C-alpha cells in the first residue's frame, strides 16, 4: 500500500525510521511517526500540529521522559511496532473517507489519532492536544483549502 502514499507521506515514514535510529531505538513506534510528521515540516499534518502549539521540542521532551534512549544506534531496517502498523493501516481508510485516492501526511496524522492509544497519543494528550481537537483542526484546515 505504500505505492498509494504521496511523496511527502513516504518521506515522513522514511524520516520516522531515522528519528528512531538517532534516539538509539530499535522499533519505529507511533511517536516516531509523530516526530516525522512534524520534522518534515511542510504538509497539512505539520501545519495542523504547529497550529495547535505542538512543537518538535515538546514531543522530543516527552519521548525522552516516557521512552528514553538506548545505548547504541542500530544499523539496518528498524521494524514498525504493532501500534505503528495499525496507524499506517488506518491511514488508508482516513484518506478514502475524506475523498482522497492518495495517502497524504494529514491521513497519517488522522490514522495516529484514530489508533488513539500508543505513545504518540499519550504525548499529544500530555502536551494539551486532545484527540478530537486534533481531528477537528485537520478538518478545519482542509476546509480552508476548498476555497
Amino acid at each position: 500500500m505504500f505505492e498509494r502514499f504521496t511523496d511527502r507521506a513516504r518521506r515522513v515514514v522514511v524520516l520516522a525510521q531515522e528519528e528512531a535510529r538517532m534516539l538509539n531505538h530499535n522499533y519505529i513506534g507511533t511517536e516516531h511517526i509523530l516526530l516525522g510528521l512534524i520534522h518534515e515540516g511542510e504538509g497539512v499534518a505539520a501545519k495542523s500540529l504547529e497550529s495547535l502549539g505542538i512543537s518538535l521540542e515538546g514531543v522530543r521532551s516527552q519521548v525522552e521522559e516516557i521512552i528514553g534512549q538506548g545505548q547504541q544506534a542500530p544499523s539496518g531496517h528498524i521494524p514498525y511496532t504493532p501500534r505503528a502498523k495499525k496507524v499506517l493501516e488506518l491511514s488508508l481508510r482516513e484518506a478514502l473517507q475524506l475523498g482522497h485516492n492518495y495517502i497524504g501526511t494529514e491521513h497519517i496524522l488522522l490514522g495516529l489519532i484514530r489508533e488513539g492509544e500508543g505513545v504518540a497519543a499519550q504525548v499529544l494528550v500530555k502536551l494539551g492536544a486532545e484527540l478530537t481537537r486534533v481531528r477537528q483542526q485537520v478538518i478545519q484546515l482542509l476546509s480552508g483549502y476548498l476555497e
Partner: peptide
Amino acid sequence: WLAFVLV
C-alpha cells in the same frame, strides 16, 4: 508493507 521502510 507492512513491516519495514518501505515493505
